């Protein structure tokens, strides 16, 4: 069966393309603590019907481009902007971590 993942949309700055942030939880191999991790997927939507903060489902698919191998299955929740804000601030904090 084709893999199905669920995540928020964090970028719609491309044509017929969204960016989905998928969240994962798993015990640490050694310490047994429940670790939480994130990944970004470029999902295909030929109808431009998804925007920022839509918790959507993506499904495995035949390649569309270099980095796009997932399509958007359906919409789950809308207006969930807080997750996008959290992702943005985490990504923004990097300009503080520079050395030069």
């Amino acid at each position: 069966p084709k893999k199905v993942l669920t995540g928020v949309v964090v970028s719609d700055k491309m044509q017929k393309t969204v960016t989905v942030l998928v969240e994962r939880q798993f015990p640490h191999p050694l310490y047994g603590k429940v670790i939480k991790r994130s990944k970004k997927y470029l999902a295909h939507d030929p109808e431009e019907k998804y925007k920022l903060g839509d918790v959507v489902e993506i499904i495995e698919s035949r390649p569309i481009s270099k980095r796009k191998r997932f399509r958007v299955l359906r919409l789950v929740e809308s207006g969930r902007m807080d997750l996008v804000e959290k992702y943005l601030i985490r990504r923004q904090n990097y300009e503080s971590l520079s050395k030069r």
Partner: protein, 124 residues
């Protein structure tokens, strides 16, 4: 530390340091003597320890110890170098295998002949 501090950073693994760098991960090396000399112990001991300054088939020139009652090592003798540090002399960390290339077995040994390589004496 916290389990969080262990997840974030983990534990550093301890790596060993080779006590015999000149060998380059080999049981022995082959070298040529350049200086055959005698030196003095560190402090609580006193003697004249025989020492050979060998150049190896590696890129190393190192001092080695010549064990036994006597030797025959000249200035160009081909020798075999073995691991093992001498406690007294500060800097020598190799031995010479007696009775391989040019170093000969210590004459008239009777007890530990495998070390200080000497053939079994004829009894008749």
């Amino acid at each position: 530390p916290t389990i969080n501090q262990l997840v974030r950073k983990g534990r550093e693994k301890v790596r060993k340091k080779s006590k015999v760098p000149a060998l380059k991960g080999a049981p022995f090396r082959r070298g040529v003597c350049t200086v055959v000399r005698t030196v003095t112990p560190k402090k609580p001991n006193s003697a004249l320890r025989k020492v050979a300054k060998v150049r190896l088939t590696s890129g190393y020139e190192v001092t080695a110890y010549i064990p036994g009652e006597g030797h025959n090592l000249q200035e160009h003798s081909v020798v075999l170098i073995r691991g093992g540090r001498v406690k007294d002399l500060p800097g020598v960390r190799y031995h010479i295998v007696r009775g391989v290339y040019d170093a000969a077995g210590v004459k008239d040994r009777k007890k530990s002949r495998s070390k200080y390589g000497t053939k079994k004496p004829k009894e008749a």
